[PDB]
């Protein structure tokens, strides 16, 4: 029936077009969403693995480092004991480091003292000179004591000289 036939014909066209439009929408707004849906999951898989490893690394790293501490402390509590012990049953001297840092030999120690005495002798004569200028002592006194310290000096220099003469 051309009538009933043409209507059915119209139905086909509306239906085919309605179908095209359906496919079009799905392919543009839905089927696209999976494009990089795998890459996403992939990226995440990559991340956990990394975190996982990092976690194991630090895990071990911290454990070993802890044993180093509980060990580095025993060799510390010990040495600190031996050091704080040396300061008891061993007179660590009056703060004068002089007693600690000494000459390599008794001979040398002697030399240091003679040298010191030599200078110290001048200083003393120098000072008494000043004392005379200030008027603290008369010329009479300065000469006597002066000649004495100057004399004791000649000896000290000869002494130093006789210990070092044999050295040519």
């Amino acid at each position: 029936p051309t009538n009933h036939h043409e209507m059915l014909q119209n139905l086909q066209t509306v239906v085919n077009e309605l179908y095209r439009e359906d496919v079009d929408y799905v392919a543009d707004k839905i089927l696209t969403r999976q494009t990089v849906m795998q890459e996403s999951i992939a990226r995440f898989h990559e991340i956990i693995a990394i975190d996982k490893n990092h976690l194991r690394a630090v895990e071990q790293a911290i454990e070993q480092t802890m044993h180093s501490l509980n060990a580095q402390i025993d060799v510390l509590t010990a040495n600190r004991a031996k050091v704080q012990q040396f300061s008891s049953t061993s007179h660590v001297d009056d703060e004068d480091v002089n007693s600690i840092a000494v000459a390599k030999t008794d001979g040398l120690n002697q030399l240091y003292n003679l040298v010191a005495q030599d200078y110290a002798l001048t200083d003393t004569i120098e000072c008494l000179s000043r004392m005379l200028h200030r008027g603290t002592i008369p010329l009479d006194t300065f000469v006597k004591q002066g000649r004495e310290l100057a004399r004791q000096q000649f000896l000290v220099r000869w002494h130093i000289q006789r210990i070092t003469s044999p050295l040519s």
């Binding site: 976690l55 000494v102 030399l111 040298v115």
Partner: protein
Amino acid sequence: MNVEELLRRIPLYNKYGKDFPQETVTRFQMPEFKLPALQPTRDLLCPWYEECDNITKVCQLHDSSNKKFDQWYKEQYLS
């Protein structure tokens, strides 16, 4: 100078030999420790999961359309 030199030319010693304490221990410096962040990434997953879930629902809705039509198509042109 002669004696002066000789004296200084020879090194001084520490009254106590090996009895004098020394720093035989070095400072053990602790290494740097960093634990990775997880919460941010954890949150970034929700939306990705949710996207999939909604697409799913969209497909069900879409795919369930033919049946809804048949039910209607029946009452309309049938018993």
